[PDB]
Amino acid sequence: GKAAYVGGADLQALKKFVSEGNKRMDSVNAIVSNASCIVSDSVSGMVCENPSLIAPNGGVYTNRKMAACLRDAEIILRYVSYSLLSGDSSVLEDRCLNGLKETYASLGVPAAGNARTISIMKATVIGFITNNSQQKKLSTPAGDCSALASEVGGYFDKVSSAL
Amino acid sequence: KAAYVGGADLQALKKFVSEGNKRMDSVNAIVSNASCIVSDSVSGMVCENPSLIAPNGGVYTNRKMAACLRDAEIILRYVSYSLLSGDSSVLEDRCLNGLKETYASLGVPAAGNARTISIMKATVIGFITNNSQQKKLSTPAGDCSALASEVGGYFDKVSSALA
Amino acid sequence: AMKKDSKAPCVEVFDERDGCKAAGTQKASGDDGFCVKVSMKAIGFNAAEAASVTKNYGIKRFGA
Amino acid sequence: AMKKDSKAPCVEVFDERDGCKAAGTQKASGDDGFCVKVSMKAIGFNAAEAASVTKNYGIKRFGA
Ligand SMILES: *CCC1=C(C)C(=O)N/C1=C\c1[nH]c(/C=C2\N=C(C[C@H]3NC(=O)C([C@H](*)C)=C3C)C(C)=C2CCC(=O)O)c(CCC(=O)O)c1C
Ligand SMILES: *CCC1=C(C)C(=O)N/C1=C\c1[nH]c(/C=C2\N=C(C[C@H]3NC(=O)C([C@H](*)C)=C3C)C(C)=C2CCC(=O)O)c(CCC(=O)O)c1C
Ligand SMILES: *[C@@H](C)[C@H]1/C(=C/C2=NC(=C\c3[nH]c(C[C@H]4NC(=O)C(C=C)=C4C)c(C)c3CCC(=O)O)/C(CCC(=O)O)=C2C)NC(=O)[C@@H]1C
Ligand SMILES: *[C@@H](C)[C@H]1/C(=C/C2=NC(=C\c3[nH]c(C[C@H]4NC(=O)C(C=C)=C4C)c(C)c3CCC(=O)O)/C(CCC(=O)O)=C2C)NC(=O)[C@@H]1C
Ligand SMILES: *[C@@H](C)[C@H]1/C(=C/C2=NC(=C\c3[nH]c(C[C@H]4NC(=O)C(C=C)=C4C)c(C)c3CCC(=O)O)/C(CCC(=O)O)=C2C)NC(=O)[C@@H]1C
Ligand SMILES: *[C@@H](C)[C@H]1/C(=C/C2=NC(=C\c3[nH]c(C[C@H]4NC(=O)C(C=C)=C4C)c(C)c3CCC(=O)O)/C(CCC(=O)O)=C2C)NC(=O)[C@@H]1C
Ligand SMILES: *[C@H](C)[C@H]1/C(=C/C2=NC(=C\c3[nH]c(C[C@H]4NC(=O)C(C=C)=C4C)c(C)c3CCC(=O)O)/C(CCC(=O)O)=C2C)NC(=O)[C@@H]1C
Ligand SMILES: *[C@H](C)[C@H]1/C(=C/C2=NC(=C\c3[nH]c(C[C@H]4NC(=O)C(C=C)=C4C)c(C)c3CCC(=O)O)/C(CCC(=O)O)=C2C)NC(=O)[C@@H]1C
């Protein structure tokens, strides 16, 4: 119920405990430093492939419903960013996904829309981690982050499957 | 602390400045896009003169670059307040008075400042006149030529004070 | 005079004519859905954005 | 369980190996310039970003 600050020997142990610690911190940093554009580009992509989502009484018609959806995409992205930091999905599973499928069935949050937002978020995050992003590149030493792109891909897939 | 102007308070304000409704959209366009305006203008400064980020150049190292980005936002925000109120007295007194002399002390290069300001000016005017290419304003369509000339004049005030 | 404290007027413009209201935000008298907020805030340093511009300044974005 | 509280883990990653330090931010001990901060925060609604997506979803950006 407070902020955790991890540095010094605490962080050195965390970074030995996870695989590829230094590249992993860069990967986390890429997600959280670009969180707003990742979310907006993915939800925008949802809509432009299916613009009836923003037609009257569609899923994200009106600013309140669109705002709730952008908020949810960010929540999900941040649980994924924490899974990549820690390298396990326990917290994503128990505190974000657990019961979420049933919530969205009652509220009328359509599944095909969510799955596209998630796939675009996954594609966008992988593009950053692999420096295939075109408007912005990461400021890191050059190298191969393919293993970490795969792993974060699995966290997103867990979300997709859960929904 | 914060002042809030609405209802009858705000209705009379939109009456003492010209084109109240388009004016408020114009202010909202500046502040809602403050980060991209600032970052595209400082970036263009550097891509036009990349020696600004070479060793001991004006925005070499993150601290100097961060300070410059900060100043560009400060200046952009004093201009947004000028467009809101229809005059430049606060910009002149609280932002420009003493600033050229502070910059010549710290060696902040005038050539670079002049270019940051010109791109921020071109960017704001582009938004207000529907010449922005990635994102448009969510407004009724029409002509905002007069308000583009006015905000241009406030930017021109900054350029002359720092030239 | 410019005070060297980084503080600038932060303007917020609100258009809530769709009627959606947030608990704890009726800071002024009115029901037509319009409001303008102004506060003076110290503008902060953003190292992340600084790093990004240093790396990425040479990329043309937004169809500029 | 998902609590419907809108709270998510907000991770911030710091690399301050250039030596630059902001007053008041030294919350942990170390000698290498690295820090990770984690907190749970409620993710808020952003009407301005909602407005922008509603208007601009059909424009391809970023070389995407
Ligand atoms: C706020 C970001 C933005 C969105 C979103 C959008 O739709 N347009 C946006 C910004 C914008 N920029 C300009 C104009 C210029 N931008 C630059 C800097 C970039 N040019 C480079 O060569 C470069 C380094 C490689 C940059 C980075 C420049 C130089 C301009 C022109 C300034 C001038 O003197 O005319 C605009 C204005 C309209 C346009 O597309 O030019 C906008 C809206
Ligand atoms: C965070 C913004 C960003 C920057 C900055 C950058 O450099 N790259 C960025 C984002 C990014 N997006 C993608 C991939 C996709 N984006 C979309 C949505 C847009 N496509 C549309 O058709 C549409 C409406 C007209 C959009 C808005 C889509 C569909 C994708 C591909 C996803 C998929 O097909 O599964 C990436 C990935 C790399 C790339 O360039 O595609 C990135 C980095
Ligand atoms: C419904 C959920 C909407 C939405 C509403 C929000 N408004 C937020 C802040 C806010 N709104 C106003 C304007 C309002 N207050 C007034 O006094 C009057 C006119 C007399 C009106 C038109 C103000 C002044 C404020 C700031 C309150 C303050 O000074 O602290 C708000 C908070 C945003 C956040 O916490 O991130 C919300 C959520 N937002 C949405 O997405 C839907 C469409
Ligand atoms: C995919 C992730 C990227 C890519 C990442 C690489 N980073 C490499 C080395 C590296 N990164 C850091 C900073 C990181 N460590 C931390 O503790 C934190 C903050 C808490 C940060 C943000 C460091 C210190 C290092 C090693 C030392 C250095 O060179 O300064 C790296 C080299 C291989 C490796 O170290 O395993 C890579 C490949 N590189 C890419 O090309 C994509 C886009
Ligand atoms: C250049 C500025 C733009 C352009 C702007 C236009 N806005 C027009 C009418 C209008 N705008 C608002 C919202 C505005 N008024 C407020 O009080 C506040 C918040 C405090 C804001 C955000 C309203 C309520 C209106 C009234 C008309 C309506 O609801 O449709 C407008 C029509 C001409 C005029 O009213 O003077 C224009 C042209 N339009 C463009 O194409 C560029 C990009
Ligand atoms: C010098 C002006 C730099 C710059 C520094 C800033 N850091 C800011 C926040 C911050 N930094 C850390 C990491 C630091 N604290 C530690 O305990 C250790 C390791 C043991 C390190 C590496 C943290 C944890 C934080 C957040 C503090 C908190 O959450 O209470 C910061 C933000 C201040 C603001 O918002 O204005 C700054 C400016 N930033 C720059 O641009 C230059 C390059
Ligand atoms: C960016 C386009 C420039 C660039 C800007 C730099 N400014 C630096 C320090 C600085 N800036 C101000 C003025 C600022 N503070 C205010 O209170 C207001 C208005 C109310 C403004 C616009 C001051 C007072 C200072 C020094 C004190 C401080 O930072 O709080 C700066 C660092 C200079 C240094 O470390 O000596 C830079 C790099 N530099 C460039 O090359 C481009 C053209
Ligand atoms: C965006 C890609 C979707 C879309 C999203 C919507 N979600 C809406 C309400 C809502 N979302 C949640 C789950 C959210 N809250 C949490 O605490 C967590 C995890 C910790 C998450 C993932 C809840 C509990 C709720 C209802 C309560 C609330 O909004 O705070 C929503 C509004 C639904 C309504 O008005 O009944 C939307 C529009 N909608 C779409 O069409 C796309 C596909």
Numbering used by the authors:
A (entry chain B): 14 to 176
B (entry chain D): 15 to 177
C (entry chain F), D (entry chain A): 1 to 64
Authors' account:
Four new structures of HaPE555 were determined (resolutions: 1.57 Å, 1.67 Å, 1.73 Å and 1.95 Å). The largest peak of HaPE555 (555 A) is by far the most abundant PBP constituting approximately 63% of the overall protein complement (with other HaPE555 spectrotype peaks contributing 8%). All five crystal forms of protein HaPE555 are constructed from continuous filaments of PBPs, which are organized into two-dimensional rafts. The filaments are generated via knobs-into-holes packing but differ in the distances between adjacent molecules along the filament (having either tight or loose interfaces). This packing brings the chromophores of neighboring PBPs closer together increasing the possibility of energy transfer. The bulk antenna proteins, HaPE555 and HaPE560, are densely packed to form a concentrated glass of proteins as evidenced by electron micrographs and FRAP experiments. It is also possible that the rafts of HaPE555 filaments seen in all crystal forms are part of the organizing principle of the antenna architecture. We have shown that HaPE555 and HaPE560 form the bulk of the light harvesting antenna (roughly 6/7 of the PBPs) and capture the highest energy photons. Thus, HaPE555 and HaPE560 have evolved to capture photons that would be otherwise lost by the integral membrane photosystems: they plug a spectral hole.
